[PDB]
């Protein structure tokens with residue numbers, strides 16, 4: 001019930017090299033993968049090799065994993081392969097700019113987890129699957145999609161020739177999987193608020209301690225959210241464009257509601273388009289700014305994320321006031 005890549009797909013991958021000019025641009029937090037679809041899987045291998053070294057995974061098994069993950073992202077407007085790699089890229093930048101804070105094991109786990117974090121997304125919110133009344137909400141009743149995504153990741157690992165973690169001890173194997181699980185569950189935005197609040201406090205009292213595993217988990221979680229949302233840290237044109245993609249998905253789920261005489265919340269209602277700038281302002285102020293603010297406090301090198309989010313914010317203020 002999992003989808004595998006073909007020999008063609010994965011071998012083509014092994015042969016790919018990254019054009020010299022992108023090398024510098026990839027290191028930047030605002031880098032946009034948009035213009036480079038062909039390369040996306042190659043871009044991930046590259047980021048892997050630069051994070052954890054060229055012989056951290058067997059190249060054959062790695063390329064097979066990457067290409068089978070691709071094949072399990074659906075052709076929805078926003079929760080797709082492209083989102084998969086963007087989040088992956090942002091975590092690379094974060095890992096690279098904080099290199100000694102994390103273990104080899106965390107850097108492998110987190111890059112993989114980002115790639116896999118929305119696997120087999122159908123373009124439906126957790127609310128929609130539960131609130132009416134899909135087979136997966138009968139199976140997991142909190143964080144529905146995210147438990148599914150992790151379970152997909154594990155199913156891809158368990159496929160013939162795909163287990164990129166096979167050469168770890170079973171202690172190390174069972175540790176990274178646990179890193180990956182927490183990482184993917186942390187992408188459930190509903191968990192983020194409680195998590196960000198804890199962290200905020202712990203930082204404030206000066207009681208945050210990266211040697212304490214439960215603290216560690218919390219920081220990673222925040223990192224996960226900050227990567228999940230990084231669309232808002234691109235340059236305006238890109239950000240604007242991506243907003244269209246996320247709204248296209250919302251509105252389609254709103255269209256499905258309307259089809260059962262149920263009015264969707266305004267966020268999901270394409271007849272409520274002109275409230276979008278306002279809604280974006282809201283989101284930046286209630287969700288994104290606080291995310292990047294706290295992330296910067298804990299990991300100062302991540303400041304450029306906060307800096308760009310601030311710029312997009314002021315772009316949205318400008319759309320509202322009638323000047324874009």
Ligand SMILES: Cc1cc(C)n2nc(CCNc3ccc4ccccc4n3)nc2n1
Pocket residue numbers: 229231232242243246266267268272273275276279280282283
């Ligand atoms: C890149 C990215 C990733 C995520 C998860 N979100 N979630 C949002 C919520 C928008 N909020 C709202 C809230 C209320 C609204 C009301 C009307 C129109 C739009 C509205 N919009 N915007 C995102 N952008």
Ligand SMILES: [Mg+2]
Pocket residue numbers: 117118145146187188
């Ligand atoms: Mg998700």
Ligand SMILES: [Zn+2]
Pocket residue numbers: 083087117118187228
């Ligand atoms: Zn996501």
